[PDB]
Each structure stands twice: as C-alpha cells, then as structure tokens.
Write an enzyme that holds these catalytic residues in place. Structure first.
Site, PDB file in Angstrom:
ATOM      1  CG  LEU A  43      63.145  85.666 -40.866  1.00 39.86           C
ATOM      2  CD1 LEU A  43      64.427  84.864 -41.002  1.00 39.86           C
ATOM      3  CD2 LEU A  43      63.446  87.124 -40.564  1.00 39.86           C
ATOM      4  CG  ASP A  44      60.968  90.007 -46.819  1.00 40.77           C
ATOM      5  OD1 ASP A  44      60.326  89.243 -47.570  1.00 40.77           O
ATOM      6  OD2 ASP A  44      61.047  91.238 -47.005  1.00 40.77           O
ATOM      7  CB  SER A  45      62.945  86.970 -50.140  1.00 43.76           C
ATOM      8  OG  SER A  45      62.280  88.204 -50.347  1.00 43.76           O
TER       9      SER A  45
ATOM     10  CG  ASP B  17      64.659  89.721 -43.274  1.00 45.42           C
ATOM     11  OD1 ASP B  17      65.286  90.773 -43.523  1.00 45.42           O
ATOM     12  OD2 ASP B  17      63.494  89.713 -42.827  1.00 45.42           O
ATOM     13  CD  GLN B  18      67.261  82.126 -48.005  1.00 46.24           C
ATOM     14  OE1 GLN B  18      67.099  82.610 -49.124  1.00 46.24           O
ATOM     15  NE2 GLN B  18      68.049  81.080 -47.785  1.00 46.24           N
TER      16      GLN B  18
END
Lengths: 50, 70, 177, 56, 459, 171, 87, 101
Positions: free
Chosen positions: G41-43, G45-46
């Site tokens: 995922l991505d930051s 997305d977090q």
C-alpha cells in the site's frame, strides 16, 4: 466534686445579674416622677417598680 | 448482568452529619411546635379592650400573644 | 513541534497531516457523500501528481503553498467528532472520573458491601508495592547519564516483573463510569 | 373568592413541597422523578381551575 | 451590661482550671450558653434606647454586633482546635485566654456610652489580636503584617484621642446622650476641618478606606483562622460603629467634607473588586472582597440618609457572617492541601460534594442573592446613593457585575473542572467542619426571614 | 375584625348568573364541592378552637400616652425636659409614618378595586394621598439620619420665615 | 442506547470494512497484514484507512497515534485501549 | 554544607486511620463523641431553635405595630370632625417667636 467547674460560668451570670438589679436601686431618683408616667400609687404598692 | 463497580467518594460521613443535624434540630423542634400548637389551641390569643377607669395595667398586659406576654 | 516521541516533525509527517486536515475540511464543505467522493479523489490525484519529487526545496515550497491554499479554504466551523477536543461532548464525563485512592477512605461499614472487590484491590496494591522498587531500579540502570533525552519509557525487561511506572496508566478511570 | 385564592396558593405550596421532601430525605428515593412529575401534573390541574374561573 | 461581662471574665478560670482533654468542650459549651444569654438585648423601644447605668447602654445598632460577637466566639473555638491539636497545653490555654479577652473587650466596647471609654477599649482590642497574629501565624510575613496593622491603627487614631479630649474640654461632657442633647453646629473654619479629619481618619483606617487598606491583605492572610474571623467580622464593623457614633457631632461640615472620601471609596470598590479577578491567592481574594464591601459601607455612612444607615447595618452584619464562612472554607482547603494558592487544588466537587454545596451557598450569599440580607443592605445603599446623585448608579451597577465575576470564579477554580491528579490526600469532610459551616450559614438564612432586628436604630 | 371607617370600601354589586346555554359550567359544581369537602371541616375545627378560647378569656389594652410639653417650651441645654420632648416627637413621627402608610394602602386598594376605571373613580383617594404626602414632606423631609426635634423646629422656622417674607414681597 | 463492544466484534468490524477497499484483495489480507510491506500500500492509503476507521467507530484517532498503526491487529488493540473493552 | 540540628517536619496525621468513626474534634474517641454531642446540642437545639422562637415572639419590637394601631385611632378621629388629615406644621405656629427683620 468531679465537675464542679461547670458552675463557674452560670452562677457568675446569676450574681452578675443580681448586681444589675442593685444598680436600679441607685437610679430610682425619678421613680414615679416622670411627667409621662406620673401616677398616684395604687393601694398596697409602695413603689411603681423595683 | 455484567455490572461494574462505580467508584465514588465515601458518602458515609456527610450522610452521618446530615442525619445528626436533622435529629438534633428535630429533638427540640417537635416539642416547641407542639407547645405553640397547644398554646394557640387552648389558651389562645388575648382580646383587645379599652382600659377600665381607675385601673392601670401591667406592661406585659399590653401585648397579645401569650408567649410575648410571658 | 510538540511530541512525546520525537523532538520535531519531518516533511512527510507535515504532508500527511496536511492531507488529513484538508480531507476533513473538504468533507465538511461537501456534506453529501458522492460529491465528497468526487472531490476527495480529485484531491488524491492532486497529491499524487507531485508525489515523486526529489528536490527538497521544491517540495518545501509546494508544502508552504498548499498550507496557504488550505488556510484560504477552511470551513469556518468544521466538523468535530463529539469526543474530540472542541466537540459537543468533549470532556463531558470528567466529573464522573473519581480516582481510585478515594476507595482507601471508605468506611468499613460500606467496605463490607464489597468483600471480593476489596480483596482484589488489596492484592493489586500488594503487587504494586512489590514491584515498585524493581521498576525504579530498572529505571536507574537503563537511561544514560545526564537525564533521559526522550519521554519514552522502557518496558518490563526481565520475567516476573512489571513495566516501570504502570500504576497510573493501568488503573485509570473508564471513559463512561 | 375563597375557592380562587385557596386553589392558587395550593398550586404554589404543592410546587414547593417536593423540595422539602428531597431535603428531608434519608433513604434512596423510590423514583423521585415520578413524584415530581405527578406533583407538577396535579399542580397543572389545580391552576387550570382558576384560569377557567377567570375565563368565565 | 454586667450580666455579660462577668461570665465572659469567668470564662478564664473555666479555661485555666480544666483538664488537658476537656478545655475545648467546656469553653464551647459555656460560650454557647453566653450566646444564648445574649438574646435579652432585643428589648428595644421605638423612641428610647436601653440604658443600663451611667457606664453602659445599648441601642438597636450595638445589639446585632453584640449578638454576632458572642455568637462568633464558639465558632472560633471550634475552628481553631485542629491546627492547635499538637500544641502545648499552656499555649493552648493562652490562645483561648486571648480569644476570651478579645471578646470581653469587644462587647464592652460596643456598649460604652462615654466616648473615651469606647476609645480605650477600641484600642485595647489591638493587643490580643496582634498577639494572636504574630504568635500563631504560620509563615515569615506575620511579623511585618502585625507591624503594619498596629502602626496604621495607632498612627490613624492618636489624633482621635486628641480630638475627643478637646470635645470633653469644650462641650463639657463625652456621654453620648448628653452629646445627643447638647450638640452644636460646627461652622466653616480650618480648625473644624482638621477636627473632622481627626475624628474621621481612625475609622477611615479601620474601615478600611481605599488607599489606607494596605494592612488588610497581610493581616487577613498571615493570621490563623480565628484571627481571620475577628479580623473580618467584628473589628471592621467596630470601626463602622464608631463612625456612626461620631458623625453626629460633625454637622454640617460633613456635607462638603465627605466629598473626597466618597470618591476614594466610589472608585475604590471598583479597583479592589478588579483585583479579585486577578488574584492568585484565595485569602487575598476574600480580603479584597471585604475591602470592597466595607468601602460601600463607607459611602453609605458618609451620605448620612436613613435608608443608607439601615443598609449599612444590614450590610455589616451580613458581610461579617459571609466573610467568616468564606474564611472557614478557605482554611479547610488549606488544611487539606497545605498550600494557600487557588489553582493548586481543583475539581473538589467530585470528591467533597457537601462542602461544594456549602461553597455554592456561601458564594451565592457573597454576590447579594435575594432575599438575603446582603442584598437588602446592598439594595438600600443603592437607593440612598441614587438619591444622592444619579451617575452613582453606574458605579454601583458595574460593581454588581464584577462582584459576581469573582465570586463564581472563586466557585469554579476551587470546585469545578478536572481534579488535580497528584494530590491524593483529600480526606472526606469531618463533622466538625460541616457543623461549623452550618452554624455560620443557618443564622444568616434565618435572619432573611425576620430582618427588622438588624435594620439599625432608626428602623 | 377591622374598622370600616378607617378602611373604606364601597358596597359591592354582584350580577345574577343568567346563562344562555345548556352546558353546565364546572365552576358551580366545583364551588359546591368546595363548601362540601373544605369549608365544613375547616369551620368545625374553627368552632372547636373558638369554644376552647371562650373557655379561657383574658384581655390586653392599647397603651395611651399623655401629652408632655414639646421642644418649643423647653429650656436649652436642659436635658430633663428635652428628653421627654424628643421622645414625644419620635413617637409622633412613627405615628405619622403609619398614617401615610394607611393612605398609601387606601390608594392601592382603590386602584385594584376599580380596575380599568381607576384613573376616574379614584380621584378622592389620590387627592388625599397628595395632601398627606405634601404635609409629610413639609414636616419631616431633608433632616438626615441624625434627625431630632431641634432640626425639625429649625426647618419649620425657616419655612415660616420664607413664607412670611414671600407674603411681604407680594403685599 | 450504546450497546457494548467486544474484541471479536471490533475485529470483525475492522476486517469487514477492510475488504471493502478496492486497493486490497480480500483473499490475501489477515489480521497481521502490513500495508506497505505485505500488501504494497501507500502512506496516503494508510491515512485513508485511518479516516475510514474514524468514520466507522465514530471517534477520531489522533495523528500521532495514526502514524503508528500498521496492521489490523494494531488498530484492534488501539480501539480496545481507547474504549476499555472486555471488563 | 553542614547545617544546624533540627527535627525534620513530621508527616501529616490522618484522624480517620486510628479512628474510622472520628468526628474530627479530638483523637480520643469518647472525647470526640462528647464534643460532637455538646456542639450539636447547645448550638442547634438550644441557641438556634429557641433563639428563632424568641425572635419570632418578640413583644412588639420597636413599638412598630403599636403605631399602626395609633394611626387607626388618629385617622378615625380626624376623618370624623372634618379636620385636615395632616397639618403642614409639626408644632403650633402661634407659639413660635420668629426673629424680626
């Protein structure tokens, strides 16, 4: 007596109260002499107040 | 079920003080209220009237309620 | 700029915080969910356009311009969750959060109504006073000289012991007592 | 005339009664809010009577 | 008046021959008996005052002050028996003897018909008060506070003695009834101006007046709890009583000579009230509140109308009761937390609910909530000052804000919010403290039912 | 009871109830219930209390004060006569205060009794109130908290001097 | 009002809202699935996941704790700590 | 640095430890209970209640209501003989000697 001390304040009241009554005997110079309350004495009444 | 413990400060001392205060007030409040009711029911208040001729009253006879006269 | 774990805030942290608050404010302006989804995907695309930037001063200038954009585009009253600071019911139940040491001042007459609870409380206090000196002796030997450089605390290292300074974070009152 | 003033001051005294009732309490009251609600409804009736008299 | 002086002076063998464990019980019992005995001074007549002898008399102004003093002594005895629990027995007896001597001096000061006797015991009240403040005060600044208090009082009040001896040589008598029937008008001259100043400045200092009040936020803070009661509940009212007595002879120069001093209170009760908005100390807050209330009393006395006089009497009695109760609450908090600063202990309603109720009721009576006698006195002074001038109502109304603006503030930071975490010695309220609060407050609310016994001699 | 000459009240005129409908008003039923459930036990208890009071009777009297010479025939700095004069003046002052109170009570009673025609039907009460207020203001106002008979005498002397001088200007 | 929560209930909740994400395959993730390590995922997305957590459970997770939760079990533990579950 | 001999400050005593039923008056339990009883008896049930009863039944305080009765005489006189209800002069103007001018 174990608790005689508890008469110190009440009787000191009573004697002190008596002293005030004696002061009235020294201030009766105008007794039944005020113009507002000058009144002939009732029978069997030597003074208006004590 | 699933009851929890509700943490509260000790209300025993404050409740004890309130109980003591109410008891010590009532301990003489009930006799004085009973006394006033018995004075007013049976003995009752005075009745206003003119001063009789040749008769002077006492000072405490110039008031209405029995407790005030006393 | 005021954290218990780090002394400062990095550039990526600032960008992530900006994205969080910008999305929250956009959700405030865009009450209906589908419209919010449209403009949230637009904001995600706008943040993803300059994702792979390697010049640090260009990224900082973009961050400052985005801060100016956000401050121009705030909701005058944004949505706050009811329990978050500034919310409608923030710190509402703090009158009900009685600390547990008041239970030490309880009368024995009202302590007799809860025998098992006070037995458990006694064993908890016994555990605390048994582990306190172990916790402090762990605290002296772990931190370097000149005082700790960060507010972070060590855990329970050995076996059979408890983490240092645990009593006021375990026995804290519930949210809804 | 006598019904009027009596019922109005009964409304006032009935309203001030539960304050004394809770201030002179010792136990845990058996649903004191129900007592207050019943008292206020009865006071509403007792004050409805002289309003009707004034209307008449 | 001998029926009250003699038992008060017999209280000293009572407290000096008692056992080491029953001094408090015996002293409290017999002082409560004297307080019950005090009710026989209510025999007041609509025309004539109650004259006992050539030495003592009591009209309807001195009677509420006498009843308040002899009711206040047992309250001090109950309050001051916790910070002296570990004290040596002889020093405990000396403290009780100082309290007894102070009460005796006060109750024969309020009844002296002759003015130089009033001055003599008005200054005899200095010695036990100063001894209590400088002996049983806690911190270092009790000595400086005692020096300030004693020297302000004496340096203000020696010309009062000179003026009183001049009155005795000129008029021929100092009896208050003779002076009531032999009073001559005072013409316009510089000699009469300094006569007025010498008669007024002693009571100006003891009121206190704004600008001469610097001894109050020391002596009300460094003193112990009983010292705080006498400092806030009798002595200020003693200065007010002396002012009411001595303003009879100073007519009609007062009609202009009171012009500066009124301003010195009319603005002054603003400024000191604002100080209570920014005070870091609870006892200092109560002291400055006392300054503001007594400045309002000063204005009421100086405009010399009947409504102002009855308002001043009711205000003095109510303020004495309320200030004593507030000092008791602050002393209880200081005993529990061992510091006097207001912001240290917060959120005490969660731990001490009934003491929070007493705090709320005391604060409500402080900000003149009707129908309490605080509001009656404040209202009557307001009516009289509105009759004096119109713009004065502004100087009243703003005060009516600021008073509440500190009182509820004093209610919040001491009782509301989240409690202090690290303070864990908040014991539950004793029966003694609650009994002290109830004995302070219930007479005030009962006096709200029948206020006509405290409305002065011209009611 | 009280005396009707000091506290006057007009005889009342109550209209007869002449209904025009068939619905019974609840006021009459509630009134009948009021003399049924309330007035009868209250009157019985009062009768018992009155019998108990008639069993034990005693009287009290209204105190009468004779007239002492006033301050105008008192030698100055002679406290023996001035004390009595000042006591008489203070008693008179309290009596006049209650007289003005009685007239104020009369005016308020007239206004409440007349209702919506009070500014026409209460002319006599308003005139009596104005007269007694004028005389009270000319007798007792602007004396101060230390009022006495000498201040009142000085104020009256100044008022008569002003009236005589104003008469002399217009003669 | 306010029905009680439980650990398996809140775990079911966080998993149930996690399989409704178009960037996450529902047949791969578990309760110890890292986002940028195990899921790629991505930051950002977090951040969106944490905002979904806030909009799901009705309370806002602070940012200084939002930057630390990296697995579904960590979110479960944080919600359990903040809501005082399993008394 | 060496300092003078001095006892350290004693720890704060709790009266609820050695006496959970303490009223806060004294350490001795019997003395505690007797002091509480003395205060509650002579304060509330002796001075407060009896004092309120005394003040409530004061015999015509400051002659106040008496004046009202006197007014109910005086107006009854002055409305019966046609006299003015109140004169504008406190004293008789005949017996006042104004200075000549």
């Amino acid at each position: 007596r174990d608790h005689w001390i508890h008469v110190l304040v009440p009787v000191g009241f009573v004697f002190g109260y008596y002293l005030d009554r004696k002061n009235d005997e020294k201030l009766a110079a105008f007794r039944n002499k005020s113009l507002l309350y000058k009144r002939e004495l009732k029978p069997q009444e030597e003074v208006t107040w004590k | 079920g699933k009851r929890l413990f509700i943490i509260k400060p000790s209300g025993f001392y404050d409740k004890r003080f309130l109980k003591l205060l109410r008891f010590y007030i009532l301990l003489t409040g009930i006799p004085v209220v009973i006394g006033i009711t018995l004075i007013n029911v049976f003995i009752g208040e005075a009745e206003l009237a003119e001063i009789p001729e040749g008769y002077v009253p006492e000072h405490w006879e110039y008031f209405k309620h029995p407790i005030s006269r006393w | 700029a005021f954290l218990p774990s780090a002394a400062y805030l990095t550039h990526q942290q600032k960008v992530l915080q900006l994205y969080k608050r910008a999305l929250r404010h956009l959700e405030s302006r865009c009450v209906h969910r589908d419209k919010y989804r449209y403009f949230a995907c637009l904001l995600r695309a706008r943040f993803d356009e300059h994702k792979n930037e390697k010049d640090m001063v260009k990224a900082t200038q973009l961050l400052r311009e985005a801060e100016k954009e956000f401050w121009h585009g705030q909701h005058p009253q944004p949505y706050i969750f009811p329990e978050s600071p500034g919310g409608t019911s923030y710190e509402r139940y703090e009158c009900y959060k009685v600390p547990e040491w008041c239970l030490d001042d309880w009368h024995p007459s009202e302590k007799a109504m809860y025998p098992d609870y006070f037995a458990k409380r006694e064993q908890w206090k016994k555990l605390r006073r048994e582990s306190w000196e172990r916790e402090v002796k762990q605290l002296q030997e772990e931190t370097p000289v000149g005082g700790p450089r960060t507010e972070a605390l060590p855990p329970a290292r050995k076996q059979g012991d408890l983490p240092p300074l645990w009593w006021h974070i375990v026995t804290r009152p519930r949210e809804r007592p | 005339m006598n019904l009027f003033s009596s019922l109005t001051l009964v409304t006032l005294i009935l309203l001030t009664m539960p304050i004394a009732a809770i201030n002179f309490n010792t136990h845990k009251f058996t649903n004191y809010p129900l007592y207050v609600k019943t008292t206020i409804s009865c006071a509403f009736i007792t004050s409805m009577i002289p309003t009707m008299m004034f209307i008449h | 008046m001998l029926k009250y002086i003699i038992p008060t002076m017999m209280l000293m063998p009572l407290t000096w021959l008692s056992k080491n464990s029953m001094i408090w019980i015996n002293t409290t019992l017999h002082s409560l008996l004297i307080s019950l005995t005090s009710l026989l001074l209510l025999n007041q007549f609509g025309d004539n005052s109650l004259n006992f002898s050539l030495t003592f008399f009591s009209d309807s102004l001195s009677t509420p002050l006498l009843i308040l003093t002899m009711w206040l002594l047992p309250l001090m005895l109950m309050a001051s028996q916790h910070h002296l629990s570990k004290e040596n027995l002889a020093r405990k007896k000396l403290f009780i003897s100082m309290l007894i001597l102070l009460q005796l001096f006060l109750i024969m000061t309020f009844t002296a018909t002759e003015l130089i006797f009033f001055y003599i015991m008005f200054e005899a009240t200095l010695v036990p008060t100063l001894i209590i403040i400088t002996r049983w005060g806690n911190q270092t600044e009790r000595l400086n506070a005692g020096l300030y208090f004693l020297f302000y009082t004496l340096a203000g009040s020696l010309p009062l003695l000179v003026a009183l001896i001049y009155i005795q040589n000129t008029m021929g008598s100092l009896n208050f009834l003779i002076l009531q029937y032999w009073v001559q008008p005072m013409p316009n001259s510089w000699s009469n101006t300094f006569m007025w100043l010498a008669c007024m400045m002693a009571f100006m200092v003891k009121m206190p007046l704004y600008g001469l009040h610097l001894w109050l936020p020391k002596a009300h803070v460094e003193a112990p709890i009983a010292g705080s009661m006498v400092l806030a509940a009798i002595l200020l009212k003693l200065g007010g009583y002396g002012m009411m007595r001595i303003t009879l002879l100073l007519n009609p120069i007062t009609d202009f000579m009171a012009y500066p001093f009124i301003m010195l209170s009319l603005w002054g009760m603003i400024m000191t009230s604002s100080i209570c908005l920014r005070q870091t100390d609870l006892k200092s807050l109560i002291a400055y509140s006392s300054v503001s209330h007594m400045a309002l009393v000063i204005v009421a006395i100086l405009i010399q109308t009947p409504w102002s006089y009855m308002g001043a009497t009711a205000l003095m009695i109510a303020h004495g009761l309320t200030s004593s109760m507030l000092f008791c609450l602050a002393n209880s908090n200081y005993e529990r937390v061992h510091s006097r600063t207001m912001i240290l202990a917060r959120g005490l309603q969660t731990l001490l609910p009934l003491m929070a109720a007493w705090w709320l009721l005391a604060s409500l009576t402080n900000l003149a909530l009707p129908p309490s006698i605080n509001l009656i006195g404040e209202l009557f002074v307001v009516m009289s000052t509105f009759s004096w001038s119109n713009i004065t109502i502004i100087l009243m109304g703003l005060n009516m804000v600021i008073t509440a603006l500190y009182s509820l503030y004093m209610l919040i930071t001491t009782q509301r919010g989240k409690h202090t975490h690290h303070i864990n010695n908040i014991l539950p309220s004793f029966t003694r403290e609650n009994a002290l609060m109830s004995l302070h407050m219930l007479p005030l609310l009962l006096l709200s039912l029948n206020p006509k016994i405290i409305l002065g001699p011209l009611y | 009871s009280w005396d009707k000459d000091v506290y006057p009240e007009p005889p009342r005129r109550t209209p007869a109830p002449s209904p025009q409908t068939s619905l019974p008003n609840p006021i009459t039923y509630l009134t009948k219930a009021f003399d049924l459930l309330v007035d009868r036990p209250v009157t019985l208890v009062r009768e018992f209390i009155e019998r108990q009071h008639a069993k034990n009777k005693y009287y009290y009297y209204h105190r009468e004060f004779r007239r002492v010479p006033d301050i105008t025939e008192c030698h100055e700095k002679d406290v023996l006569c001035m004390f009595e004069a000042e006591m008489q003046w203070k008693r008179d002052y309290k009596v006049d205060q209650e007289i003005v109170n009685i007239i104020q009570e009369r005016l308020k009673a007239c206004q409440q009794r007349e209702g919506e025609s009070h500014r026409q039907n209460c002319a006599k009460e308003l005139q009596q109130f104005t007269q007694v207020v004028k005389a009270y203001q000319d007798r007792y106002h602007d004396l101060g908290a230390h009022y006495s008979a000498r201040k009142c005498l000085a104020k009256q002397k100044q008022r008569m001097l002003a009236e005589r001088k104003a008469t002399k200007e217009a003669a | 009002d306010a029905p009680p929560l439980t650990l398996e209930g809140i775990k079911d909740r966080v998993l149930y809202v996690l399989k409704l994400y178009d960037k996450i395959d529902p047949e791969k993730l578990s309760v110890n699935s890292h986002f940028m390590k195990d899921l790629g995922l991505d930051s950002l997305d977090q951040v969106e996941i944490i905002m979904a957590m806030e909009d799901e459970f009705g309370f806002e997770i602070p940012d200084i704790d939002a930057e630390k939760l990296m697995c579904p079990q960590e979110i479960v533990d944080y919600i359990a700590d903040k809501k005082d579950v399993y008394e | 640095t060496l300092r003078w001999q001095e006892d350290p400050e004693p720890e704060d005593e709790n009266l609820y430890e050695k006496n959970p039923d303490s009223h806060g008056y004294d350490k001795d339990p019997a003395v505690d209970v007797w002091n509480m009883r003395v205060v509650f008896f002579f304060g509330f049930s002796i001075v407060l209640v009896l004092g309120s009863t005394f003040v409530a039944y004061l015999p015509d305080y400051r002659m106040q209501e008496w004046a009202r009765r006197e007014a109910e005489r005086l107006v009854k006189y002055r409305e019966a003989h046609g006299l003015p209800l109140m004169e504008s002069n406190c004293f008789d103007p005949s017996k006042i000697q104004l200075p000549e001018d």
